[PDB]
Structure 1
Amino acid sequence: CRHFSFAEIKAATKNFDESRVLGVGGFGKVYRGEIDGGTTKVAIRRGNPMSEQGVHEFQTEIEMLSKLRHRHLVSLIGYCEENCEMILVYDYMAHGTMREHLYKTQNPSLPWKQRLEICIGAARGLHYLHTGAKHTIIHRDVKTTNILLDEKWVAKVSDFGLSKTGPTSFGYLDPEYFRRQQLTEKSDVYSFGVVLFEALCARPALNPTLAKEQVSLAEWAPYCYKKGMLDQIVDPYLKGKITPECFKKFAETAMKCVLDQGIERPSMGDVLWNLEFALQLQE
């Protein structure tokens, strides 16, 4: 885990030029930069150290990512705490978030096979979190803005500030958590099921202007599948492009992920295999 001086961060970002801002978020601004004499492109997060939440998320991200390595996780290159600052340095993901290629965007729509491969890549990253670290890691903030795409469209899970480990956003929250008050990796499975319906339906997980039954995609899409009308809320670009057996396998997998009770949901390894099976059924 590399430690950067603050002058390196300032140089990498061209003195935090607004030219290089990729976005703003609760933690702070995210900048595009380059390091190593310009051979490595980076995403640089500048937080606010006066904030308890920011400080807690900063330390959580470092303690988590400093020990993980996986093709489908964004890599932490380093950090800077110099001058009591909170800066995180990541691999740059040139194609942004999964969400920016699904809706409310002028990016072209993604072909179905590409969407399925993005979901498989994200599932492999989550499966690694649940089974490949020293203890189970619960991400706790799985959503389409926290799946990033690199220049070859490889999907990477990002944003670990809320994750939790060790043997103890609105439309993505596991409702069973508000009832059983327990932490389980099945809460990531739930969130990921919502991401799968987003890839298929190309609309927000939560749209608060709709009819009550439609507001939450986690409830609406299973309901439409049972009434034989899921095909009617599928992304218009996808209509006629999914084979019947792929569609059924994909939809049944997503429905199982958003069951009310976590004990009935599949593991991420089971989700991952069913998606790869769905991809074979598409061919």
Structure 2
Amino acid sequence: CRHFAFAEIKAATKNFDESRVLGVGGFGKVYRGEIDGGTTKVAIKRGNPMSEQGVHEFQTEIEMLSKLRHRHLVSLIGYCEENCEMILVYDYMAHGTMREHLYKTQNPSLPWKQRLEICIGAARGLHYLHTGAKHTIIHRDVKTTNILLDEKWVAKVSDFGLSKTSFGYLDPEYFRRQQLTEKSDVYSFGVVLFEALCARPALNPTLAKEQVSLAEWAPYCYKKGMLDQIVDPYLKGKITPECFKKFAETAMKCVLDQGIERPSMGDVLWNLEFALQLQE
């Protein structure tokens, strides 16, 4: 893992110019930059060292990512804690979050096959977290803003601040059984799947009661045989019946009330790849 002088971080971000701000997370602000004389594009996150929350997420992010390498996880390039700073340096994800291509956006809507391929990519990254590291990594904040898209639309999981060995995505079983299970990622990922299909927030607190939480509303509509009616209008008629059925049954299994009933990410990944094949 690389360490950057605080001067190199200023050079990368044209001295934290707000032209280069991409957004602000609860850790701090994120800047687009370039290092190595402009060959490598980067996203740079500045935390606040006097936030106890921030410092915990900072070391968690560095402890995790410095040992992981996977096509569908955002790579951490390096970091800077010089001058009592908290700076993280990642690969730039040129197409932003999955969420900003699903709704509340002026970006074009995504073809079904690319939506499916984005969800397979994320499922591969999550599968690697659960089976490819020394111990299972529980991401704990899987959501559509934490799936980033690079210049070639490769889906990548990000935001490892709450990782251990958001409303609407929270495993309801946590508030009841109180354990740490990777099945809590499966639950959140199932909500992500329903988001890709229906193109609406996982939690819309303005709706009728049954519809507030996508995780409950979409299973309910599928049982009633009306899931077709809350599908993204851009997707109407674009999904074959066998892909629709396989995709929806896979999402449904992920948001079961009990984590032990839920499939593994391996099983989920295989069923999405099966769905993609049934789409052709």
| TM category, shorter | over 0.9
Whole-angstrom distance in 1 between the partners of 2:92 and 2:198: 28
Paired residue secondary structure (2:88):
strand
- Residue 97 of structure 1 aligns with which residue? 97
What is the SS of the residue equivalent to 1:137? coil
Residues 183-204 of structure 1, C-alpha deviation per residue, up to 9 Å, x if partnerless? 0000000000000000000000
SS at match of 1:213: helix
* CA positional deviation for 1:252: 0.1
After superposition, what is the alpha-carbon deviation per residue over 1:162-216, rounded to whole angstroms, capped at 9, x for unaligned? Answer: 000xxx8000000000000000000000000000000000000000000000000
Deviations 1:37-72 (A, max 9, x none): 011000000000100000000000000000000000
SS of 2:90's equivalent?
strand
Alpha-carbon distance in structure 2 between the residues aligned to 1:19 and 1:95:
17
Aligned-residue CA RMSD (Å): 0.5
Aligned partner of residue 210 in structure 2, secondary structure: helix
How far apart are the structure 1 equivalents of 2:237 and 2:62? 45
Partner of 1:191: 188
Question: Matched residues in 2 for 1:181 and 1:197: separation?
Answer: 25
Displacement, 1:25?
A: 1.2
Q: Displacement, 1:263?
A: 0.2
Shift of 1:219: 0.1
Q: What are the superposed Cα offsets for residues 1-59 of structure 1, whole Å, 9 maximum, x if unpaired?
A: 00000000000000000000000111000000000001100000000010000000000
- SS of the equivalent of 2:168 reads helix
SS at match of 2:34: strand
Mapped partners of 1:103, 1:62: distance in 2: 32
Unpaired runs of 5+ residues, structure 1, are none
Matches of 2:105 and 2:119, distance apart in 1: 20
Q: Deviations over 1:87-135 (max 9, x none)?
A: 0000000000000000000000000000000000000000000000000
CA distance in 2, matches of 1:53, 1:210: 32
Shift of 1:85: 0.2
User: Following the alignment from structure 1 to structure 2, what is the Cα–Cα distance between the partners of residues 261 and 74?
Assistant: 30
Distance 1:249 1:197 in 2: 13
The C-alpha deviation readout for 1:223-254, integer Å capped at 9, x for no partner, is 00000000000000000000000000000000
How big is the shift at 1:141?
0.2
Give SS of 2:37's match: coil
Runs of 4+ in structure 1 off by over 2 angstroms are none
Cα displacement (A) at 1:218 = 0.1
1:67 equivalent in alignment to 2:67: yes
Size of the aligned set, in residue pairs, is 280
Distance 2:258 2:78 in 1: 38
The SS at the match of 1:138 is coil
2:37 and 2:273 map into 1 onto residues whose CA distance is 40
- Take 1:112 and 1:99, find their aligned partners in 2: how far apart are those partners? 15
| Separation (CA, whole Å) in 2 of partners of 1:25 and 1:159 | 10
Following the alignment from structure 2 to structure 1, what is the Cα–Cα distance between the partners of residues 55 and 279?
45
Counterpart-to-counterpart distance in 1, 2:143 and 2:5: 32
Distance 1:183 1:25 in 2: 24
